[PDB]
């Protein structure tokens, strides 16, 4: 009996899972790392507090296995998957970071994007999306790259000396997995950076030089599936732990890893993961969409370097679980995170009230930054309950007008939608969710598609699986689906999509 | 020393007051009464129940001061103040009630008034306003008579029998307390009813023909300040609690009585009630003024039948305390209704966030049905301080619309506002008030306006009082007025005044 380990080091916590060769969860770990934040709307991570909450992860996984399962020796592979765009900084000479990781969702680079928007863009943030698939945006890792130059002497120091490296989580992991001595990042996550051409999957000359970022400080790109590196490092008792030589085989974007995990191979295939927020992404093939409504072109997956590259749509949405919190610890209208369902359930409808989550403007594919949280429709009938549910609905709207868009840019009907993350346990905004689509939602039991993902490609290049479909037969009898059907089947909720077009208008409020 | 006693039977209870000579309060007794609600939108008042709260508050408080006053033999008269629009239906021979009281603020004759503004306001509800004063609306009487001589086969047959009669709370009261004698209405009252000619003071043919209401089925119109009634009812032992010939010689609906007990009698002088909803009123005079901004024309007040009928204008808002008690009975952001000011308090704005209370609508001067409760600017840093300010914000607001409105229909700048109701204890709200008009506000301390105007309708009648400007001396002694003085001076002020208009705009939701 064959083993996969799968590390998934996410935003909040790292994760590592022990997979057999019929897909079966058989061990895992979990640990926190600190979410720093120096100032308003900054976010950083320690990169060593990352790699060593991995290490702790393996470590414990793996031993724990031994002693449960005396026949459990070693793991034949081990696939990792990342937090997308976060970025780090460190010296390939003296191998010590120069900065904290700057993750995603950090707000500092700001002016760093409008710059660029202005001077490169002619006032597009749309002006590169032919070329890279993506949005002039403090999201993406080159306006970190672009800050971390301007606003670290020691960066720019080893920038001059051709010793900087900067790359994603990914790449950080498998340099440091390597004990230094590899510097690659898989296609998924550096379709994620900025600097990558969408087309050909190289890095860009054009991009590279009019951003300032040198292309020698970046990873070689790679498939997501491939020999990376063997496990060299023995920090945290790493190497001894493994016991025998340990392949690391595959790499994924984590939302790709997800994609993948939900079986999502072929054009028109489409994951939504609800959580604080929520990503959407469809699967479209080998022809790669470019969106007319403001989504993004990503790379869904490469099965080694002489496989074709597979495209994806991309959309996000920030008011979702963190509509909730919000609910909770800034306006007290319910106790608990479960009472939002709790309360929801007891009313069939909002009588009209809508509730827009746009505390920071509206995301693509409703963009509009000048939008903010509102209210409509309420009158003294109305109860918390009705603004709970009216809540809900407003995470399932959001995720229709993701999704229709999606539809037009790739010309496929989605006939299901796979949903995962931990906002998937609110049985009545599955039904919701259900009920606005008029399609099916498949919930997998076993929840954690983003390992499975990293586990798939790492066990593909090492040839514990044989092939897709293999894998796919496999999984067919280890995960199994819970289907959501739609209620009330099609547009008896004409009503509540006119409301909520009226609603996005009139939210309209910081210009 | 003489004393004058004050009923305001109110929407949701019944006070009697006895002040002395000196206005000072020196007895009083209070009842609730049910809100009947039997469908959605419909709200009536037992008016037996009205009746008998009132004789039981008047028998208390005049038990009362006999025990802490051995001197006090009589009252020299009384005055009334009552709930307006709120209409009855009685039969004359019997002398039973043909239905409930239809209050005021009840819905059930939205489809009468919809067909009376098609048919006969070809579509303007202002079609009537230069002839009454007001607008086509489910508030005034006239569309509550309809409605029952439509629906209540017992109000239709009184009316085919030549005994119907209908009226306001004053001319029930009045029948009640007479044993059924007189039949009359004061002006301020019957300027509600829709069917007044605003200008004359008398029923109007052309209205009475055209709402389908007989004109014999109306009481008879006279000033506030006038013999009414001997008081000869000896249901609830009224008279004999009395003792002695006890004359009512005050009748004025509530919200005027309250202008008047503020000592609003000249041109430009104003008050507002903040309770459940606000009314704003504004003295303007002998002169008439109608609004160029939906704001009604009504009658402040006439003291005896030779005097002058003195004009005012008048506003009101829906969501002020009813905000505040909605936020915790329904939404539970609060668990007190005081909660709202302690929170409110810890934030200094609002970071943008504006909250409109428009729960039906927004009435005049920014009239718009399809406006709804709406919350705008929310980001995740917003709290429920910030949204608490923003809904006390909102009623200093909406009050703002309607007095900047009133003062270009009657062309006077407001030196000072009066205000009064149990929501002027909220003592923030009260700075906010001030500093958005940029004006004192000036709260009495003693808290019955309304029952001392009907006092003074009474009191001034029966020669208690002398004049109008006496009465005013008097209370200059008896009645302290806290000063609410405007202090945070700003074009902060600009900012939210803007943003308040985008809200209004933004509100627009139902489409009728």
């Given at each position: 009996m064959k083993y996969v380990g799968a590390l998934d080091q996410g935003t909040i916590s790292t994760r590592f899972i022990i997979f057999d060769e019929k897909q079966c969860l058989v061990a895992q770990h979990q640990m926190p790392h600190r979410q720093l934040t120096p100032q308003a709307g900054w976010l950083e991570h320690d990169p060593m507090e990352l790699y060593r909450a991995s290490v702790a992860c393996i470590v414990a996984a793996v031993e724990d296995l031994r002693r449960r399962v005396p026949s459990f020796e070693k793991l034949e592979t081990i696939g990792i998957a990342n937090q997308r765009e976060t970025t780090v900084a460190w010296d390939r000479v003296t191998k010590e970071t120069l900065y904290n990781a700057i993750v995603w969702s950090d707000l500092r680079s700001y002016e760093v994007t409008a710059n660029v928007k202005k001077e490169l863009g002619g006032g597009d943030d749309l002006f590169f999306a032919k070329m890279n698939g993506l949005r002039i945006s403090t999201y993406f890792s080159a306006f970190k790259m672009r800050w971390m130059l301007e606003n670290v002497p020691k960066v720019e120091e080893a920038r001059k000396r051709g010793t900087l490296c900067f790359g994603t989580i990914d790449a950080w992991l498998l340099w440091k997995l390597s004990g230094g001595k590899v510097f690659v990042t898989d296609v998924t996550n550096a379709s994620r950076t900025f600097l990558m051409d969408i087309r050909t999957c190289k890095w860009s000359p054009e991009l590279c030089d009019k951003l300032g970022i040198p292309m020698a400080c970046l990873p070689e790109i790679r498939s997501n599936s491939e020999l990376f590196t063997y496990v060299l490092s023995d920090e945290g008792g790493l190497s001894t732990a493994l016991r025998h030589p340990t392949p690391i085989m595959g790499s994924i974007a984590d939302q790709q890893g997800a994609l993948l995990g939900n079986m999502c191979?072929?054009?028109?295939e489409s994951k939504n993961t609800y959580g604080t927020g929520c990503f959407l992404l469809m699967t479209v093939g080998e022809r790669i969409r470019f969106s007319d409504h403001g989504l993004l072109s990503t790379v869904a997956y490469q099965l080694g370097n002489k496989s074709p590259f597979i495209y994806a749509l991309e959309g996000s949405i920030a008011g979702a679980g963190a509509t909730i919190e919000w609910l909770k610890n800034n306006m007290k209208l319910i106790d608990d995170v479960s009472d939002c369902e709790k309360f929801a359930q007891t009313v069939s409808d909002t009588q009209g009230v809508v509730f827009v989550p746009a505390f920071s403007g509206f995301l693509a594919?409703?963009?509009?930054?000048?939008?903010r949280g509102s209210i409509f429709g309420m009158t003294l009938k109305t109860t918390r309950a009705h603004v709970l549910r009216a809540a809900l609905l407003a995470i399932a709207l959001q995720v229709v007008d993701v999704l229709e868009a999606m539809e037009k840019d790739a010309e496929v009907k989605v006939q299901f939608l796979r949903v995962d993350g931990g906002l998937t346990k609110n049985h009545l905004l599955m039904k919701m969710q259900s009920d606005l689509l008029g399609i099916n939602l498949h919930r997998p039991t076993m929840a954690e598609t983003t390992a499975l993902g990293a586990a798939l490609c790492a066990g593909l290049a090492a040839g514990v699986w044989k092939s897709l479909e293999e894998v796919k037969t496999i999984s067919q009898q280890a995960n199994v689906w819970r289907v959501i059907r739609p209620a009330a089947s099609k547009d008896s909720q004409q009503m509540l999509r006119a409301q909520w077009k009226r609603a996005k208008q009139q939210a309209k409020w910081a210009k």
């Amino acid at each position: 009996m064959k083993y996969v380990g799968a590390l998934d080091q996410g935003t909040i916590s790292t994760r590592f899972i022990i997979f057999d060769e019929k897909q079966c969860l058989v061990a895992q770990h979990q640990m926190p790392h600190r979410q720093l934040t120096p100032q308003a709307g900054w976010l950083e991570h320690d990169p060593m507090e990352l790699y060593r909450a991995s290490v702790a992860c393996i470590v414990a996984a793996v031993e724990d296995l031994r002693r449960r399962v005396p026949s459990f020796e070693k793991l034949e592979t081990i696939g990792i998957a990342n937090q997308r765009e976060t970025t780090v900084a460190w010296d390939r000479v003296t191998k010590e970071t120069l900065y904290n990781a700057i993750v995603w969702s950090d707000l500092r680079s700001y002016e760093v994007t409008a710059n660029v928007k202005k001077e490169l863009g002619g006032g597009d943030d749309l002006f590169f999306a032919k070329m890279n698939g993506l949005r002039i945006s403090t999201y993406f890792s080159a306006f970190k790259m672009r800050w971390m130059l301007e606003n670290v002497p020691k960066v720019e120091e080893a920038r001059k000396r051709g010793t900087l490296c900067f790359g994603t989580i990914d790449a950080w992991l498998l340099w440091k997995l390597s004990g230094g001595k590899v510097f690659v990042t898989d296609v998924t996550n550096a379709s994620r950076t900025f600097l990558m051409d969408i087309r050909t999957c190289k890095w860009s000359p054009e991009l590279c030089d009019k951003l300032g970022i040198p292309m020698a400080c970046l990873p070689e790109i790679r498939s997501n599936s491939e020999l990376f590196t063997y496990v060299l490092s023995d920090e945290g008792g790493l190497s001894t732990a493994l016991r025998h030589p340990t392949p690391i085989m595959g790499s994924i974007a984590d939302q790709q890893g997800a994609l993948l995990g939900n079986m999502c191979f072929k054009e028109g295939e489409s994951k939504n993961t609800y959580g604080t927020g929520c990503f959407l992404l469809m699967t479209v093939g080998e022809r790669i969409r470019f969106s007319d409504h403001g989504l993004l072109s990503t790379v869904a997956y490469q099965l080694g370097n002489k496989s074709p590259f597979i495209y994806a749509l991309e959309g996000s949405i920030a008011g979702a679980g963190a509509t909730i919190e919000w609910l909770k610890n800034n306006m007290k209208l319910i106790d608990d995170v479960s009472d939002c369902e709790k309360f929801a359930q007891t009313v069939s409808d909002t009588q009209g009230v809508v509730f827009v989550p746009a505390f920071s403007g509206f995301l693509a594919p409703s963009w509009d930054p000048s939008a903010r949280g509102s209210i409509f429709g309420m009158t003294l009938k109305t109860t918390r309950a009705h603004v709970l549910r009216a809540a809900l609905l407003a995470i399932a709207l959001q995720v229709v007008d993701v999704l229709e868009a999606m539809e037009k840019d790739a010309e496929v009907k989605v006939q299901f939608l796979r949903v995962d993350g931990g906002l998937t346990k609110n049985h009545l905004l599955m039904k919701m969710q259900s009920d606005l689509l008029g399609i099916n939602l498949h919930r997998p039991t076993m929840a954690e598609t983003t390992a499975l993902g990293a586990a798939l490609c790492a066990g593909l290049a090492a040839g514990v699986w044989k092939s897709l479909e293999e894998v796919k037969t496999i999984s067919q009898q280890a995960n199994v689906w819970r289907v959501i059907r739609p209620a009330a089947s099609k547009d008896s909720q004409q009503m509540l999509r006119a409301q909520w077009k009226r609603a996005k208008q009139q939210a309209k409020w910081a210009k």
